[PDB]
Amino acid sequence: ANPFSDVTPDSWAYQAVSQLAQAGIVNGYPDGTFKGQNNITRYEMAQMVAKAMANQDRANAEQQAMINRLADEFSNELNNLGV
Amino acid sequence: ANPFSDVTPDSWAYQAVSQLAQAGIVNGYPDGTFKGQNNITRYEMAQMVAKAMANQDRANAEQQAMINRLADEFSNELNNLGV
Amino acid sequence: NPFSDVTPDSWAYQAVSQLAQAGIVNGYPDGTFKGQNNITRYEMAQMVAKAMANQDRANAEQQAMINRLADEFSNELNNLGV
């Protein structure tokens, strides 16, 4: 539940956002976010998910499915952000 | 407007925050932000505006007027941020 | 304003400095603690919130530092959902 606990590189959600960054759908994230094996806070993840949701129409159907699932997973932080 | 939708370089607000960065009033933003002509999210723009409203003592009369206009234009995200 | 500054003179800046050195605070921008630059209350609060998320790493006085930071940045932490 804690918004500044971590999401780890071995998790589905980390790998999802990292792959959406590979795709250019996630862009504009703080430099070094995907560097090495550093965790990402749920709050930072949610910002990346919110931006992907705004760039949603450019995703393939599989990526749209990833965004949909991420949006559920981070709904509490997304609501905090006004999304 | 979604808080993580994009503000484009043609918008008054984009150009104003870029000018405030050149002047030093907006500082401490992500590197990359004003290099070239890439979009900035409303949420990041709002963080830059909040910073300038904190730094508004540095501003000349015309810059203070710009900042006031910006705080209006991003009032929704500024309210989310607690500004 | 959550984006008003915290200076390097401040107890709070130095405490998060110390906790980052201790490894309790991580994942902050690279230029955060260098060049004697101020930190916004917003970025301070994010680091404090990681310190709370990791508070089981801290000893008694580091916990006391975390507790004091959590009070100091309570408004920003609330806005962040913490």
Residue numbers in the entry:
A (entry chain B), B (entry chain A): 23 to 105
C (entry chain C): 24 to 105
Structure paper excerpt:
Surprisingly, the crystallized stalk does not fold into a coiled-coil but forms a compact trimer composed mainly of α-helices (residues 23–105). The residues that form the coiled-coil in the extended AlphaFold2 prediction instead form helical hairpins and extensive intra-protomer interactions rather than interact with the other chains in the asymmetric unit. The protomer interfaces form grooves on one side of the trimer that could potentially accommodate ligands. However, mapping of the previously identified putative PG-binding residues onto the stalk crystal structure shows they are spread across the structure, suggesting that this conformation does not bind PG. The protomer fold of the stalk observed in the crystal structures aligns well with an alternative, compact conformation predicted by AlphaFold2. However, the trimerization interface in the compact stalk prediction is different: residues that are far away in the crystal structure (e.g., M75) interact in the predicted compact conformation. We considered that this compact state could be an unstable high energy conformation (hence the low prediction confidence), and that the stalk construct is stabilized in a similar conformation in the crystallization condition. Notably, the soluble SLH domain did not bind to V. parvula or E. coli sacculi, unlike the full-length VpOmpM1. This suggests that the structure of the isolated SLH domain is different than in the full-length protein, as observed by cryo-EM. Therefore, we do not believe that the conformation observed in the crystal structure is the result of crystal packing.
Most diderm phyla from the Terrabacteria group have recently been shown to lack well-characterised OM attachment systems, but instead have OmpM, which could represent an ancestral tethering system in bacteria. OmpM consists of an N-terminal periplasmic S-layer homology (SLH) domain connected via a linker region to a C-terminal OM β-barrel. Here we use single particle cryo-EM, X-ray crystallography, molecular dynamics simulations, bioinformatic analyses and functional assays to show that OmpM1 from V. parvula (VpOmpM1) is a general porin with similar structural and functional properties to E. coli OmpF, with an additional mobile periplasmic region that can bind V. parvula PG and take on different folds.
